[PDB]
Design a protein around this ligand. Structure first.
Ligand SMILES: O=c1ccn([C@@H]2O[C@H](COP(=O)(O)OP(=O)(O)O)[C@@H](O)[C@H]2O)c(=O)[nH]1
Length: 419
């Protein structure tokens, strides 16, 4: 069981190159099932889910190869079924459904039983395809969708906002006959990226990033080269890494416009920030951060995925600051871990009240949340002594070699074993 062993305190400073966003890469990879011509997806991070997706795609008859890029040739998809064995570890598997039925007239995806770990409904996906003219067949453990000819554009009102279902509906609609309108569409930067990818293949889509996406169906999608957007949360993580350690950092391969809220929040903390078209710099000038007040909310407001990071910031900032989760519940489980590191805070309902301390102290800590976990590693960097963060496979799943990046920033960190 891998652990990160960190020796602090160390000032995090220098440069880091942001990896492609896993959350844009995934939907884009599935959308490539629509491309009749070879496609080159650049800036794809080396992550578990990417591998699982490549395997799933190969199983379908897709010709797949990888490095920085993932090369895809789906001009010849022959197997319209995603089996239990390959979808078992990945919810995103449902994304194969729509492209299959839209392009080939049929798709089937295996669904983990009710009791399986991480098992969640995909109702929105299925009923969305239905609105598009897909004939649906359901039996415990699988969903099949089919159509005679092209799907039919429809006016679709979403009762629940869903990143997942928005991708499925927007994707399949690029091949349908007519216009499809998605009201209450997810607004995420990853949704905009997915749409941009589709458009790059010849799709007709507008409104991406707003509450209303409009797709005009076309004959077919071609091939080409597309560069996956930078990972906004990863970028936020490294900004905070410099912000809490008096450091200065320049993030390469970034997209400032996907971080308005995070950047303004950092400025409130006394950070000196600069941005370019593809870079972001953060300079603390050796100073301790100032405590901030944070309210998480839907994009493009302050992101809940930056919460644990900002909590940490408050915990070592000058002064008191409150962090409120306005939508999500139970997002503070990891706070007791930080308090074991010498932090001072109180959790009250949907908020964490932070009292900044001078220096944290090393400890053996653990968190199951990717973000919280990463925050633990950051704390280990600036804390006094030795910190051992357990179960870092959680981090490995969403961050591309975070220890390598941290090391280049000046961290005393290492991957160690323990069973
Ligand atoms: O088929 C679906 C897809 C989503 N949701 C709900 O909408 C929320 C947001 O979904 P989204 O796809 O944005 O996130 P994900 O499920 O990918 O974590 C979920 O937590 C569910 O509560 C649902 O009920 N059925």
């Amino acid at each position: 069981m891998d652990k990160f062993r960190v020796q602090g305190p160390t000032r995090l400073q220098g440069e880091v190159t942001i990896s492609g966003a896993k959350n844009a890469a995934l939907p884009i990879l599935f959308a490539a099932l629509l491309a009749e011509e070879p496609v080159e997806i650049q800036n794809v991070p080396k992550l578990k889910d990417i591998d699982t997706t490549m395997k799933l795609l190969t199983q379908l008859g897709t010709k797949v190869e990888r490095x920085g890029s993932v090369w895809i040739d789906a001009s010849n998809v022959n197997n319209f079924s995603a089996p239990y064995d390959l979808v078992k570890t990945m919810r995103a598997s449902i994304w194969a459904l729509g492209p299959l039925v839209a392009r080939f007239g049929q798709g089937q995806v295996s669904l983990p039983g009710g009791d399986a770990i991480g098992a969640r409904p995909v109702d929105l996906h299925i009923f969305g395809l239905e609105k598009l003219g897909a004939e649906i067949k359901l039996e415990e453990g699988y969903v099949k969708a089919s159509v005679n000819g092209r799907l039919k554009g429809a006016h679709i009102v979403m009762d629940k906002v869903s990143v997942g279902a928005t991708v499925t509906i927007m994707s399949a609609a690029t091949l349908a006959e007519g216009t499809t309108i998605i009201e209450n569409a997810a607004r995420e930067p990853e949704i905009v990226d997915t749409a941009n990818f589709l458009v790059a293949l010849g799709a007709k889509i507008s409104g991406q990033g707003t509450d209303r996406i409009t797709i005009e169906g076309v004959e077919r999608l071609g091939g080409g080269v597309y560069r996956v957007l930078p990972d906004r949360i990863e970028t936020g993580t490294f900004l905070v890494a410099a912000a809490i350690s008096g450091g200065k950092i320049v993030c390469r391969n970034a997209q400032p416009d996907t971080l308005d809220a995070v950047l303004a929040k950092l400025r409130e903390a006394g950070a000196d920030i600069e941005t370019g078209e593809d870079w972001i710099s953060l300079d603390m000038h050796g100073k301790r951060p100032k405590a901030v007040t944070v309210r998480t909310a839907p994009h493009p407001a302050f992101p809940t995925d930056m919460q644990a990071q900002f909590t940490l910031l408050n915990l070592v900032a000058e002064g008191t600051g409150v962090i409120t989760e306005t939508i999500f519940e139970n997002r503070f489980m990891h706070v007791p871990e930080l308090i074991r590191m010498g932090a001072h805070a109180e959790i009250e309902s949907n908020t964490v009240i932070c009292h900044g301390v001078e220096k944290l102290s090393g400890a053996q800590v653990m968190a199951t949340d990717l973000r919280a976990s990463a925050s633990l590693v950051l704390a280990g960097c600036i804390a006094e002594g030795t910190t051992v963060v357990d179960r870092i496979y959680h981090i490995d799943r969403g961050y591309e070699r975070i220890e390598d990046k941290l090391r280049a920033l000046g961290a005393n960190i290492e991957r160690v074993k323990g069973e």
